[PDB]
Write a protein that binds this ligand. Structure first.
Ligand code: SF4
Ligand code: SF4
Ligand code: SF4
Ligand code: FCO
Ligand SMILES: [Fe+2]
Ligand code: NI
Ligand SMILES: [S]
Lengths: 275, 487
């Protein structure tokens, strides 16, 4: 049986979705045809407008309590949620704000999975200078008094293995709970499976670091600490997993910017200034 | 009769399209960008160097375009002169995503309006009278063969687009959102090994473009010839120039240029202004603002406003952007595949892009331009893989100036893109973005002129109000990115 998924986008850049399209364990064709039943996703679905929204609401009721609500992007609460209009319901008028959609759907979901640092912690849309009242899913849940299992799979964007891995583990648990456990989460609600490791501790440049050998420039040898690397205060398994099918990763190429952390970007800024 | 479509799916971001139909044709249209984040506000007070990371989050589909525009704006402000290897390396990082983006768009965003997918979500539900290849081709075997040919390509393209991201990651670190482009050049010097790896991946992608993508485009157009005659619009196009071919930025793979009211002219950035008359923003002065003095004061309550997309105008004229604009402006020679198939399938003798003449300006003309541009970009990438020099310096170290201005010009896969940066006290004082879809999906300006997409919708056939397929088809031919249009 395939895991039903309703994927909604608020204040997102579609980067989390594109990162998922790059998956290799398994590849995207297998994910869509064998693993999940992607019922609603604005970027790739065949239907549009009223037909798309009606199908989503149809699935939310028929699969009430049995679909994963995936959230990409932050939730803006200022100006009555008007900074993010996700749709227009057929029943004469009725523009639906992201606030309304999440308030409606989240209680009917099996669990809400906030993919990306935006939905999980607020991220860039919620950074200093915004005037949209941008909120993370967890902060919105608290404000709304929503009592629902919420798994945070951060990263800007999250590596596809983290997203797919978290969802497969969660679905196996739904199918046979006494035999398949839910991913163990840290205090920020993210899977220890992928976010338990410290980048710096697992970094290949660690010996250079310990011997005070720092690259004075992006193109000079040595640890990237002086270039602004935030690996010391960042927890993700990037140093072992790497990116884009093991082709390269942020630290080898430049510096880690701490994209998976709740305080990204403000707490990791300036990006090119050493921690 | 009025029809509203929100969300208009298989487009990037939040888009609402509303049309009025009369006598089986669209008689009026309004385009709305429904989601705002305010990057121009968020960037204020920050270390200018952070912008190349932050602006990438405007869009996960075209982050390299924004990164490129940003690092060039910073190079300009910081007074950095990029190295030859730095310039080539940034073209290789960015070029791999041009390929990814166009392939992603045609198959995964546009193709479902013509190709019947399997009977499982998200391929269904779909309009009951969708006018797909299976509905158009009356001979059963030919209909199945063409639909299957298209669908198998859709599926293979899922893998092809992923390989282009491995290519971006080669010198970019990862994708979406690269780490490899910063003010001063590129952070990683290409090794002979890595160049060979990019090339091997590249060969696979190029082969697909030539043997599969181009053939399907031309074949599709031969079935939908009526679509080469609607979705016209203004016929004004603009391009800023992309992929500098020399260190002084005197030459580009596709030149800056403007084509308005039937005349070709050189591009002058002083004539670019943004209007907010029907946009949710307040300007301190009427008459439009040049980007160097642009303002970002959101106002969802502004009477008469209906979108978060501002309205850019060149000499007060609406101009469309994207592959069609670049190809029309540059008028390159068509691929061998296109030249042959235009003769074999349409009886058209063409050597250059403009030989499509009259309607390169249509729903299908936009898809053709994008496919041809993909092949053109691939020809160039193969050339750059030969020019790149393993071991040669890609990075120049520069310092944040106390006060300066900088402007970065380029072309995102969806169209013309510029980033204007203004520094004060070594921090971002103002940052203005005039981005791609902004030019295509804009609302009416203060003088009342419709944006390129709203204008192109006028005249589109809607013989079936319950199944208004051509409205979405016209919109998707522009490959709109609302995340970019609004930022
Ligand atoms: S987490 Fe980053 S990649 Fe994902 S939607 Fe937010 S800005 Fe885009
Ligand atoms: S490169 Fe970053 S994570 Fe690696 S040893 Fe140096 S500071 Fe630590
Ligand atoms: S190395 Fe750092 S910036 Fe790169 S993906 Fe991992 S946590 Fe994010
Ligand atoms: N391509 C792309 Fe994105 C848009 N529109 C930018 O700039
Ligand atoms: Fe802007
Ligand atoms: Ni984009
Ligand atoms: S891009």
């Amino acid at each position: 049986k395939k895991a039903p998924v309703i994927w909604v986008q608020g204040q997102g850049c579609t980067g989390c979705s594109v990162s998922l399209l790059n998956a290799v364990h398994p590849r995207i064709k297998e994910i869509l045809l064998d693993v999940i039943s992607l019922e609603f996703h604005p970027t790739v679905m065949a239907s549009e407008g009223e037909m798309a929204l009606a199908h989503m609401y149809e699935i939310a009721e028929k699969f009430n309590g049995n679909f994963f609500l995936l959230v990409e992007g932050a939730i803006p609460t200022a100006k009555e949620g008007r900074y993010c209009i996700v749709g227009e319901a057929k029943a004469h008028h009725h523009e639906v704000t992201m606030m309304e959609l999440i308030r409606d759907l989240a209680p009917k979901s099996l669990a809400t999975v906030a993919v990306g640092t935006c939905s999980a912690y607020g991220g860039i849309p919620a950074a200093e200078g915004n005037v949209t009242g941008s909120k993370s899913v967890r902060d919105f849940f608290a404000d709304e008094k929503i009592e629902k299992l919420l798994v945070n799979v951060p990263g800007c964007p999250p590596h596809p293995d983290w997203m797919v891995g978290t969802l497969v583990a969660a679905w196996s648990h739904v199918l046979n709970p006494t035999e398949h456990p839910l991913p163990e989460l840290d205090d920020d609600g993210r899977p220890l499976l992928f976010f338990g490791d410290n980048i710096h501790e697992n970094c290949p440049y660690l010996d250079k670091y310990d011997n005070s050998e720092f690259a004075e420039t992006f193109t000079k040898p040595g640890c990237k600490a002086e270039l602004g690397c935030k690996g010391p205060s960042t927890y993700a398994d990037c140093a072992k997993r790497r990116w884009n099918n093991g082709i390269n990763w942020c630290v080898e190429n430049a510096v880690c910017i701490g994209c998976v952390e709740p305080d990204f970007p403000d707490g990791k800024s300036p990006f090119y200034v050493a921690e | 009769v009025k029809i509203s479509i929100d969300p208009l799916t298989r487009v990037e971001g939040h888009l609402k399209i509303e049309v009025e139909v009369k006598d089986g044709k669209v008689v009026d249209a309004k385009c709305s960008g429904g989601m705002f984040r305010g990057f121009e506000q968020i960037l204020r007070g920050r270390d200018p160097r952070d912008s190349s990371q932050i602006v990438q989050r405007i869009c996960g589909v075209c982050p390299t375009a924004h990164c490129t525009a940003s690092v060039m704006a910073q190079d300009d402000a910081f007074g950095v002169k990029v190295t030859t290897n730095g310039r080539i390396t940034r073209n290789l990082i960015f070029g791999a995503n041009y390929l990814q983006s166009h392939i992603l768009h045609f198959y995964h965003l546009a193709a479902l309006d013509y190709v019947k997918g399997p009977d499982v979500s998200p391929f269904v539900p779909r309009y009951a009278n969708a006018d797909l290849l299976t509905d158009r081709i009356k001979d059963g075997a030919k209909a199945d063969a063409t639909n299957t040919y298209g669908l198998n390509q859709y599926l293979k393209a899922l893998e092809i687009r992923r390989i282009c991201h491995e290519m971006v990651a080669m010198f970019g670190g990862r994708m979406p959102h690269v780490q490899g482009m910063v003010v001063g050049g590129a952070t990683e010097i290409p090794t002979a090994d890595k160049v060979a790896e990019y090339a091997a991946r590249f060969k696979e992608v190029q082969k697909f473009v030539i043997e599969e993508y181009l053939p399907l485009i031309y074949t599709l157009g031969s079935v939908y010839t009526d679509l080469f005659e609607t979705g016209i619009g203004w016929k004004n196009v603009i391009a800023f120039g992309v992929f500098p071919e020399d260190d002084d930025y005197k030459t580009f793979l596709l030149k800056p240029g403007v084509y308005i009211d039937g005349k070709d002219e050189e591009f002058d950035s002083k004539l670019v202004k943004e209007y907010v008359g029907h946009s949710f923003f307040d300007h301190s002065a009427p008459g439009g603002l040049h980007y160097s003095v642009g303002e970002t004061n959101p106002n969802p309550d502004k009477p008469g406003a209906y979108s978060f997309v501002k309205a850019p105008r060149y000499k007060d004229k609406p101009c469309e952007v994207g592959p069609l604009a670049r190809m029309w402006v540059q008028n390159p020679e068509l691929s061998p595949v296109g030249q042959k198939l235009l003769k074999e399938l349409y009886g058209i003798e063409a050597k250059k892009f403009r030989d499509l003449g009259d309607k390169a300006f249509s729903i299908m003309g936009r898809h053709v331009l994008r496919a041809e541009e993909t092949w053109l970009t691939a020809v160039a990438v193969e050339k750059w893989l030969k020019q790149v020099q393993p071991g040669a310096e890609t990075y120049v170290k520069s310092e944040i100036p106390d006060a300066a201005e900088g402007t970065g010009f380029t072309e995102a896969p969806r169209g013309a893109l510029l980033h204007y940066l203004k520094i004060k006290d070594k921090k971002i004082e103002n940052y203005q973005i005039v981005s791609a879809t902004l030019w295509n999906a804009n609302p009416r300006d203060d003088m009342g002129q419709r944006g390129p997409i709203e204008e192109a919708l006028i005249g589109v056939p809607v013989p079936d109000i319950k199944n208004p397929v051509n409205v979405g088809r016209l919109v998707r031919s522009y490959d709109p990115x609302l995340g970019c249009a609004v930022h």
